[PDB]
Amino acid sequence: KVFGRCELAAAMKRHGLDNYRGYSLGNWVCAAKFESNFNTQATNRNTDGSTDYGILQINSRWWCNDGRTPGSRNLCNIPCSALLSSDITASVNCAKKIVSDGNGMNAWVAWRNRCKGTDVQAWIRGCRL
């Protein structure tokens, strides 16, 4: 499913991402934009052989099991396929664990490079929330 901007903002808020670990809703929507273009079904292979899955491009090296990432962990205790659902619950739950890991949203390279320090509020402007 390809979410609308305000539609995703709303779903993220319902699942408790707004101001989660101090990251306003705009930061999350911005990350999703650059990670997946709001496409739940986005996948991308990393150089190291791991793969990134879903609207927030969660990496199989640490966070989910895909059965083909040597030496990896599954710290969210889920099959990576669950992260491709049109239901974002799994993705949000896993993101909460990631962003709590020590480095905050810097875990997402695209957030660091593209969202951090910018006018992230623009991402939720005009949304009924």
Active site residues: 35, 52
User: Residue 1 in contact with residue 86, Cβ under 8 Å?
Assistant: yes
Closer to Na ion by CB, 26 or 54: give it: 54
**Residue with the closest Cβ to Na ion?**
72
- Binding residues (CB under 5 A) for Na ion: these are 60, 65, 69, 72, 74
User: Residue 75 in contact with residue 88, Cβ under 8 Å?
Assistant: no
Which residue type sits at 10? A
Any idea what the Cα angle at residue 27 is, between residues 24 and 30, rounded to 5°? 145
In the bound complex, what is the minimum distance in angstroms from residue 21's beta carbon to Cl ion? 14
In the bound complex, what is the minimum distance in angstroms from residue 1's beta carbon to Cl ion? 15
Alpha helix (H) ranges present in 15-108?
A: 25-36, 89-99
Counting contacts by CB under 5 A, is residue 5 touching Cl ion?
A: yes
Q: In what order do the strands lie in the sheet with 43-45?
A: 43-45, 51-53, 58-59
Residues 6 or more apart whose CB falls under 8 angstroms from that of 77 comprise none
Q: Which of Cl ion, Na ion, none sits in contact with 24, Cβ below 5 to 8 A by type?
A: Cl ion
| Per-residue contact flags (x/-) with Cl ion for residues 7 to 36, judged by CB under 5 A | -----------------xxx----------
Backbone phi, psi, residue 78, to 5°: -145, 150
Site for Cl ion in 53-72 (CB under 5 A): 65, 69, 72
Residues making contact with Cl ion (CB under 5 A): 5, 24-26, 65, 69, 72, 79, 110, 113, 121
Binding-site residues? 101
